[PDB]
């Protein structure tokens, strides 16, 4: 999926989960363990929560964050 010939990637569990959310709009933050999935423009305005390894941190979506994969916005290792 890291090629235009294949197409942008999102997991099936996340894809069906976000579809239900937009059917009713913004709601309680979405907890997900998926970090390998790109960010689609269908979930702009949500506060999905990615799991960095120990906790779920809420990442706020924005038009700018529409080509970056989900895990980019959860620092997995702490430092100072």
């Amino acid at each position: 999926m890291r090629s235009l010939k294949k197409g942008p990637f999102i997991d099936l569990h996340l894809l069906k989960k976000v579809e239900k959310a937009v059917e009713s709009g913004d709601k309680k933050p979405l907890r997900t363990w998926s970090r390998r999935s790109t960010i689609f423009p269908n979930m702009i305005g949500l506060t999905i929560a990615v799991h960095n390894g120990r906790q779920h941190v809420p990442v706020f979506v924005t038009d700018e964050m529409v080509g970056h994969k989900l895990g980019e916005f959860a620092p997995t290792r702490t430092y100072r």
């Binding site: 700018e64 964050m65 970056h68 980019e72 916005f73 620092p75």
Partner: protein, 114 residues
């Protein structure tokens, strides 16, 4: 002669004189000269103004010194203020392509300071 920002170097081959433009390297400098009808071996000094005139407009098809630095700074600013990973690496002055910082990365971190 005088191109978009400035073209100081005479006495150099034209193909390697336009490389002093922030946005023109070697493969584009080769292309521009062929597009304008000027060979590569010919020195810039020998070029009469009937040639450099077309050179001052050919470079307008590539983003160059006048705007290239503004876009790159804007490009970096977008990631830095985003909060993503590559913004964080820029913020701390550390490698952003995901490589070793345990021993190497003197270029990114800076001179060896205790």
């Amino acid at each position: 002669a005088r191109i978009a920002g400035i073209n100081i170097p005479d006495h150099k081959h034209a193909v390697i004189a336009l490389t002093s433009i922030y946005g023109v390297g070697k493969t584009r400098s080769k292309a521009i000269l062929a597009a304008a009808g000027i060979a590569e071996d010919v020195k810039i000094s020998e070029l009469s103004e009937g040639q450099i005139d077309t050179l001052r407009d050919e470079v307008a098809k590539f983003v160059v010194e006048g705007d290239l630095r503004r876009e790159i700074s804007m490009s970096i600013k977008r990631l830095m203020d985003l909060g993503c990973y590559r913004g964080l690496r820029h913020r701390r002055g550390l490698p952003v392509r995901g490589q070793r910082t345990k021993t190497n990365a003197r270029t990114r971190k800076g001179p060896r300071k205790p």
